[PDB]
Chain A
Amino acid sequence: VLEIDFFKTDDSFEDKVFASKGRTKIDMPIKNRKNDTHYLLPDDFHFSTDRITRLFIKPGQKMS
């Protein structure tokens, strides 16, 4: 905002920042904290149209 008036002792309920929190959730749920995947991608084999259109034993030739 504009600025802060650090000379204000009038400021009411500024100690509210130190409240207890009762029934306000501040921790992430314990389920998500650990994941077996470790957030990596699986092995990638790169299946492309170029891959499929080609023959197995004669990769130079293509099919429709």
Chain B
Amino acid sequence: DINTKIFNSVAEVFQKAQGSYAGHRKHIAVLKKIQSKAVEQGYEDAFNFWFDKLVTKILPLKKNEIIGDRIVKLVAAFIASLERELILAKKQNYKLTNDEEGIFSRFVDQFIRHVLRGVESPDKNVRFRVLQLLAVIMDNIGEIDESLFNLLILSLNKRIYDREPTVRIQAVFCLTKFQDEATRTLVASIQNDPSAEVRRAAMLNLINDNNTRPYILERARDVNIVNRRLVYSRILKSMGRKCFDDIEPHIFDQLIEWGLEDRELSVRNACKRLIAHDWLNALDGDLIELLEKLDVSRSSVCVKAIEALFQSRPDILSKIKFPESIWKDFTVEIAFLFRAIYLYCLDNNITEMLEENFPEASKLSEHLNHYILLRYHDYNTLEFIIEQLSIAAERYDYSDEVGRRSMLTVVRNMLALTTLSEPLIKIGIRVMKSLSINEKDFVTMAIEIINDIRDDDIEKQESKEASSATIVLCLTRSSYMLELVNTPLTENILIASLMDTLITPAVRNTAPNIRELGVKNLGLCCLLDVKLAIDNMYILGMCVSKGNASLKYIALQVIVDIFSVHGNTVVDGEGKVDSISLHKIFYKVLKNNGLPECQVIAAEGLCKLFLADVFTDDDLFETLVLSYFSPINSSNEALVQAFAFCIPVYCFSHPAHQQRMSRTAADILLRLCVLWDDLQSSVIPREAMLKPNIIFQQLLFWTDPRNLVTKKDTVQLTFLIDVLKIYAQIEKKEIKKMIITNINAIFLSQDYSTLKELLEYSDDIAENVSKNALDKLRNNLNSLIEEINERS
């Protein structure tokens, strides 16, 4: 009959189409004839029925199987072929006379419904194939009545939360084609879905609109590295030039900083290549304009971006020369290049293009001077240019004694300017250090400058004591000078004078701006003379206790540094402050989250001292670990990250350090379980802190012996037994279950006495699966017992 003939005709196509794409265009050609004739004889439903039947055979095939992929493409090519004939008759405006429209609308509608019968099937393979078929025909189904449109959206909206990420990706692909609801559904998945590959699918296929771009670029911090890399590898690359117009400049700068500072190399290189190769090319080799986009005047990312470029493109590097003609049109971009090239070539020793590309020191001193005159005889751009040239000047070549004096008399006149901005005092003094032959030549020239500023102030007064503003200038200059001094004060007499004449009076009076400078100047001197540090330990304790948050900030840093340089000889003795007194100063600051900036200095500072062994008090070290796990300090990311990096290296650097952790860790664990259990009570400000099992295996990890940079030691052993004595001191078994299950992370093998003691406790605890976990320990343990016993 003709019904079986239809089946044989369509099955023959599917039989050959599964094996190769070679004849797919011919296969569609015949399928359209089988259909057309089938409807002619009134068997439209026989064709639709058999077409469906053969498609069901590929539904259970798993994602990878090429045979399924080949038939999915055939199905899609068939529907796309039928629709193209309908689009042409509409676009070329000619009539169709064989009901092609009706047949198509009915075939599509019937086929989607058939395929949707397995959208919620138990077999994840058909659920994938179903949405794959849908995704690949969406563009070519044309206009569909509302019942089928509602059925589609509802079916997909359920598959966006499918159990398999593979089906969810396919659900994403389907919803992307309904963008313009579906757009918000995809943004909902870009932020909230746990699978990284689906967030990636949503991100890459989400329309790049002013409404959606913030959510797309938000994935520049995705926990997955690929999603972060793809922001620079594809998203930002796709935009091209629009990365400087339709992208907010504030988020723009944040994207480069993130990519260039990322902890992973793939992300770093991806962002590097986007700047050095893709962007630069998008701007037609114009490096100057590329720098205009990075905004050198208001960003420091360009320092890494251009060095990133220089590595990728050494050919452009040798083309930037600096003849005297360049200075006629000198801008912030060119000025930044001047320092960036010169410093980059010194670091990588490309001395080839320093003898012919850059002026000699004597000519650079004229240009540097010139801009100083324009400014102190747009003011922002002038100050910026002066800074860029001075940066290069500090590392310039002054072998030619003519250029050394020229540059020197230039910077001395600059540093003499009472109106000189602080950033230009800083770099101006560092240049004078490079120019000076030795420290004494440096301090003598520096103090000579300073004294002239204060002395000149007393003539305007004798038109007694120097003005307050004048003191700010002298101390700012001296602070940057003393940062570069490295000889004992005993050798420098003039610094002894500066102490009496200027520094200690500044520590005495107010406002802060003058007092803060006095403390920093003092602290820098204390680093050079141990006695001076001894005699000012009381002053610094008062500055943190009676000073604003800013004065605490500096005085605390001074205290921590005095300890780092001099050790414990500034404490506990005749004429010396008490250690325990300073311990209280740190503790009071460390726990005052009213000002969290200082907590990091206290948190970090104390880690620095315990690490150098300058500090070694068990009770204080315990206050640190608890402030790390504390719920009040979750707000302070810097503090948590400080403790997160310090206290692991402390243990793992020397066993005496880890030995300290072992004695405390049991008491620490105790005092955080009691805590969390009390965050259930009716007194709050729980998920604001880790749950004990996390804390335990964290604690246990630090106490593990082999993680130290030569013997078993059993430092970890002693920690555990402590953890077992404290045990049983709990309201809720839930946290007992936590502490017990995470055991067996131990390293066992010597020292008989200790392990037998450990067994005795474990036996005592033989009082729910926690029982299994503990039994796992004793059987392993009992083996160690008989082994050692028989060894004798």
Q: Residues of A with Cβ closer than 8 Å to B? A: 1, 3-7, 11, 14-15, 17-19, 21, 24-28, 30, 32-35, 38-49, 52, 55-58, 60-61, 63-64
Query: What is the distance, in angstroms, from B742's C-beta to the closest C-beta of chain A?
Result: 23
B319 interface residue per 8 A CB criterion = no
Specify which of B60, B161, B637 is in contact with A33 (CB 8 Å cutoff). B161
A1 contact set on B, CB distance < 8 A:
67
B46 interface residue per 8 A CB criterion = no
Residue of A nearest to B524 (CB): A57
List, sorted by A's number, 7 A–B pairs whose CB atoms are closer than 8 Å: A17-B56, A18-B121, A26-B121, A41-B221, A55-B564, A57-B483, A57-B558
A17 contact set on B, CB distance < 8 A:
56, 59-60, 118, 121, 123, 126
A11 near B57 with CB under 8 A, answer yes
Could you tell me the distance between the alpha carbons of A35 and B224 in the complex, rounded to whole angstroms?
A: 15
A47 contact set on B, CB distance < 8 A:
604, 641-642, 644-646
Could you tell me the distance between the alpha carbons of A4 and B558 in the complex, rounded to whole angstroms?
A: 79
B253 interface residue per 8 A CB criterion = no
Specify which of B122, B218, B484, B612 is in contact with A19 (CB 8 Å cutoff). B122
A26 near B611 with CB under 8 A, answer no
A32 contact set on B, CB distance < 8 A:
194
The verdict on A57 contacting B523 (CB below 8 Å), with A41-B221, A52-B608 known, is yes
A26 near B124 with CB under 8 A, answer yes
Q: Besides A47-B604, A57-B561, 4 other CB < 8 A contacts?
A: A6-B15, A17-B121, A55-B565, A58-B527
B117 near A18 with CB under 8 A, answer yes
B193 contact set on A, CB distance < 8 A:
33
A3 contact set on B, CB distance < 8 A:
15, 18-19, 67
Q: Which 4 A-B pairs have the closest CB atoms?
A: A56-B557, A24-B122, A47-B645, A21-B122
Query: What is the distance, in angstroms, from A34's C-beta to the closest C-beta of chain B?
Result: 5
- Give chain B interface residues in 418-453, CB to chain A under 8 Å: none
- Give chain B interface residues in 626-682, CB to chain A under 8 Å: 637-638, 641-642, 644-646, 649
The verdict on A39 contacting B194 (CB below 8 Å), with A17-B118, A52-B607 known, is yes
B261 near A58 with CB under 8 A, answer no
Say whether chain B's binding surface is mostly helix, strand, loop, or mixed: helix
Could you tell me the distance between the alpha carbons of A61 and B483 in the complex, rounded to whole angstroms?
A: 9
Could you tell me the distance between the alpha carbons of A60 and B334 in the complex, rounded to whole angstroms?
A: 29
Query: What is the distance, in angstroms, from B243's C-beta to the closest C-beta of chain A?
Result: 21
B564 near A63 with CB under 8 A, answer yes
Could you tell me the distance between the alpha carbons of A30 and B162 in the complex, rounded to whole angstroms?
A: 10
A38 contact set on B, CB distance < 8 A:
191-192, 218
Could you tell me the distance between the alpha carbons of A26 and B67 in the complex, rounded to whole angstroms?
A: 25
Q: Residues of B with Cβ closer than 8 Å to A? A: 8, 11, 14-15, 18-19, 54, 56-60, 67, 117-118, 120-124, 126-127, 158, 161-163, 168, 191-194, 196, 199, 218, 221-224, 261, 263, 483-484, 486, 520, 523-524, 527, 554, 557-558, 560-561, 564-565, 601, 604-605, 607-608, 611-612, 637-638, 641-642, 644-646, 649
B57 near A27 with CB under 8 A, answer no
Could you tell me the distance between the alpha carbons of A25 and B123 in the complex, rounded to whole angstroms?
A: 10
A40 contact set on B, CB distance < 8 A:
218, 221-223
Query: What is the distance, in angstroms, from B390's C-beta to the closest C-beta of chain A?
Result: 18
Query: What is the distance, in angstroms, from A32's C-beta to the closest C-beta of chain B?
Result: 5
A26 near B524 with CB under 8 A, answer no
* Of listed B18, B59, B561, residue having the most chain A CB within 10 A: B561
Residue of A nearest to B556 (CB): A56
A19 contact set on B, CB distance < 8 A:
121-122
A21 contact set on B, CB distance < 8 A:
120-122
Specify which of B67, B192, B527 is in contact with A4 (CB 8 Å cutoff). B67
B557 near A57 with CB under 8 A, answer yes
Specify which of B19, B161, B558, B645 is in contact with A27 (CB 8 Å cutoff). B161
Query: What is the distance, in angstroms, from A60's C-beta to the closest C-beta of chain B?
Result: 7
Could you tell me the distance between the alpha carbons of A52 and B648 in the complex, rounded to whole angstroms?
A: 13
Residue of A nearest to B638 (CB): A45
B120 near A26 with CB under 8 A, answer yes
Could you tell me the distance between the alpha carbons of A46 and B19 in the complex, rounded to whole angstroms?
A: 55
The verdict on A15 contacting B56 (CB below 8 Å), with A43-B637, A45-B641 known, is yes
Query: What is the distance, in angstroms, from A48's C-beta to the closest C-beta of chain B?
Result: 8
Could you tell me the distance between the alpha carbons of A56 and B606 in the complex, rounded to whole angstroms?
A: 12
B222 near A63 with CB under 8 A, answer no
A42 near B127 with CB under 8 A, answer no
The verdict on A27 contacting B162 (CB below 8 Å), with A4-B58, A19-B122 known, is yes
A63 near B524 with CB under 8 A, answer no
Query: What is the distance, in angstroms, from B668's C-beta to the closest C-beta of chain A?
Result: 21
B161 near A6 with CB under 8 A, answer no
The verdict on A14 contacting B57 (CB below 8 Å), with A4-B67, A56-B601 known, is yes
B644 contact set on A, CB distance < 8 A:
47
Query: What is the distance, in angstroms, from B550's C-beta to the closest C-beta of chain A?
Result: 14
Residue of B nearest to A59 (CB): B483
Specify which of B161, B218, B558, B608 is in contact with A28 (CB 8 Å cutoff). B161
Could you tell me the distance between the alpha carbons of A23 and B67 in the complex, rounded to whole angstroms?
A: 31
Could you tell me the distance between the alpha carbons of A47 and B483 in the complex, rounded to whole angstroms?
A: 23
A28 contact set on B, CB distance < 8 A:
161-163, 168
A45 contact set on B, CB distance < 8 A:
637-638, 641-642
Could you tell me the distance between the alpha carbons of A48 and B484 in the complex, rounded to whole angstroms?
A: 24
The verdict on A41 contacting B612 (CB below 8 Å), with A14-B57, A28-B161 known, is no
Query: What is the distance, in angstroms, from B60's C-beta to the closest C-beta of chain A?
Result: 5
Query: What is the distance, in angstroms, from B681's C-beta to the closest C-beta of chain A?
Result: 24
Specify which of A34, A41, A56 is in contact with B561 (CB 8 Å cutoff). A56
Query: What is the distance, in angstroms, from A51's C-beta to the closest C-beta of chain B?
Result: 9
A27 contact set on B, CB distance < 8 A:
158, 161-163
Query: What is the distance, in angstroms, from A50's C-beta to the closest C-beta of chain B?
Result: 12
Could you tell me the distance between the alpha carbons of A14 and B612 in the complex, rounded to whole angstroms?
A: 72
The verdict on A6 contacting B11 (CB below 8 Å), with A26-B120, A57-B520, A58-B527 known, is yes
A58 contact set on B, CB distance < 8 A:
483, 524, 527, 561
Query: What is the distance, in angstroms, from B351's C-beta to the closest C-beta of chain A?
Result: 25
Residue of B nearest to A46 (CB): B261
Could you tell me the distance between the alpha carbons of A4 and B16 in the complex, rounded to whole angstroms?
A: 10
Specify which of A44, A55, A61, A63 is in contact with B261 (CB 8 Å cutoff). A44
B645 contact set on A, CB distance < 8 A:
47-48, 52
Query: What is the distance, in angstroms, from A10's C-beta to the closest C-beta of chain B?
Result: 12
Query: What is the distance, in angstroms, from A40's C-beta to the closest C-beta of chain B?
Result: 4
The verdict on A39 contacting B223 (CB below 8 Å), with A26-B124, A57-B520 known, is yes
Residue of A nearest to B645 (CB): A47
Query: What is the distance, in angstroms, from B164's C-beta to the closest C-beta of chain A?
Result: 8
Could you tell me the distance between the alpha carbons of A55 and B122 in the complex, rounded to whole angstroms?
A: 63
B14 contact set on A, CB distance < 8 A:
4, 6
Could you tell me the distance between the alpha carbons of A38 and B188 in the complex, rounded to whole angstroms?
A: 10
Residue of A nearest to B485 (CB): A58
Could you tell me the distance between the alpha carbons of A39 and B193 in the complex, rounded to whole angstroms?
A: 8
Residue of B nearest to A24 (CB): B122
Residue of B nearest to A15 (CB): B56
Could you tell me the distance between the alpha carbons of A57 and B19 in the complex, rounded to whole angstroms?
A: 73
A42 near B161 with CB under 8 A, answer no
B523 contact set on A, CB distance < 8 A:
57
Could you tell me the distance between the alpha carbons of A14 and B532 in the complex, rounded to whole angstroms?
A: 91
Residue of A nearest to B523 (CB): A57
A26 near B222 with CB under 8 A, answer no
A24 contact set on B, CB distance < 8 A:
122
